A paper describes a structure:
As an alternative to mAbs, we previously computationally designed two classes of minibinder proteins that block the SARS-CoV-2 receptor binding domain (RBD) interaction with its host receptor, angiotensin converting enzyme 2 (ACE2). Here, we sought to develop constructs containing three minibinder domains that could simultaneously engage all three RBDs on a single S protein, and by virtue of this multivalent binding, potently neutralize SARS-CoV-2 variants. The second consists of self-assembling homotrimers of minibinders geometrically matched to the 3 RBDs on a single spike; although AHB2 is lower affinity than LCB1 and LCB3, and the sites targeted are less diverse than the first class, homotrimers of AHB2 have the advantage that the ACE2 binding site is inherently less mutable as the virus must bind ACE2 to infect cells.
Residue numbers in the entry:
A (entry chain C): 333 to 527
B (entry chain K): 1 to 75
Write the structure that this text describes.
């Protein structure tokens, strides 16, 4: 049996920044979801539309795995009907989302002594994101009526901002790895089935 | 919990300043954008730094800012 490569999604050595989340397409494989939903290593495992225990008897056309790193207190924004810095400018889910949001603490990986500043999120944007939209532009944001001309300075900001992840952070601002599994069923044969 | 106590107020500033980015126009918006940026920048200096006096100075400024932002939200 050709099992779906979930080990390349969860046990990945590197996760993307939330402003530029990494999408992997899962297709034409056997998807065992009882391996993840029994590990008891996840702090969050919330499924919308599909029951975690019924998940395995369903066939889909494609399954998309969107991965990124955010703060613990920001995990609540990875859900339908939410607003906030992440929900609006970095990663937006649809109100009719069908899928599972899985997250766990990576304080032993994504934190460093002196502070790990390699993770970024979008601080400013002209408008809110649409569902599953991404924006990787670094064009300088104009806060007022005064033109920036691509120059950062007074009333002109670089649109991205870093996180400060260190081992001794409070739980709310420790780093968390998030994987969102989106399940879609189209007209195509539906090649992603469980055991 | 001194370091954590300060983060609490810095986040409150960033959250309120963020909401105001969809409400305010003109100078009021520009001002809110600054405060938003300030809070998220100070969250990085809070973690990196030392000396209790620097930590308290950040808190006091953050609290003045939060109260200021609420004057924009109510109007
Ligand atoms: C993600 O990896 C964990 C751990 O895998 C082990 O440690 C790695 C560093 C590497 O050495 C692997 O080859 C090891 O297997 C997986 O958790 C294990 O899952 C197996 C199978 O169910 C179980 O027998 C082990 O006891 C689990 N170990 C622990 C510590 O829980 C986990 O399943 C992987 N995630 C995915 C989606 O594959």
């Amino acid at each position: 049996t050709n099992l779906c490569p979930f080990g390349e999604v969860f046990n990945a050595t590197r996760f993307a920044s939330v402003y530029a989340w990494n999408r992997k397409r899962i297709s034409n494989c056997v998807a065992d979801y009882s391996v993840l939903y029994n590990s008891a290593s996840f702090s969050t495992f919330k499924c919308y539309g599909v029951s975690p225990t019924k998940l395995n008897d369903l066939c889909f056309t494609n399954v998309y795995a969107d991965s990124f790193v955010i703060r613990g207190d920001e995990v609540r924004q990875i859900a339908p009907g939410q607003t906030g810095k992440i929900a609006d400018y970095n990663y937006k889910l649809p109100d009719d989302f069908t899928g599972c949001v899985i997250a766990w603490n990576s304080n032993n990986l994504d934190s460093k002594v002196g502070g790990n500043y390699n993770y970024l999120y979008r601080l400013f944007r002209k408008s809110n994101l649409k569902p599953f939209e991404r924006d990787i532009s670094t064009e300088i944001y104009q806060a007022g009526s005064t033109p920036c001309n691509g120059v950062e300075g007074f009333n002109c900001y670089f649109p991205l901002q870093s996180y400060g992840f260190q081992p001794t952070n409070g739980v709310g601002y420790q780093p968390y790895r998030v994987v969102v599994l989106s399940f879609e069923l189209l007209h195509a044969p539906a090649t992603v089935c469980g055991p | 919990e001194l370091e954590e106590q300060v983060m609490h107020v810095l986040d409150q500033v960033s959250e309120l300043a963020h909401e105001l980015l969809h409400k305010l126009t003109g100078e009021e918006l520009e001002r809110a954008a600054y405060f938003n940026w300030w809070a998220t920048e100070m969250m990085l200096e809070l973690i990196k730094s030392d000396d209790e006096r620097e930590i308290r100075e950040i808190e006091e400024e953050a609290r003045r800012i939060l109260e200021h932002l609420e004057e924009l939200a109510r109007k």
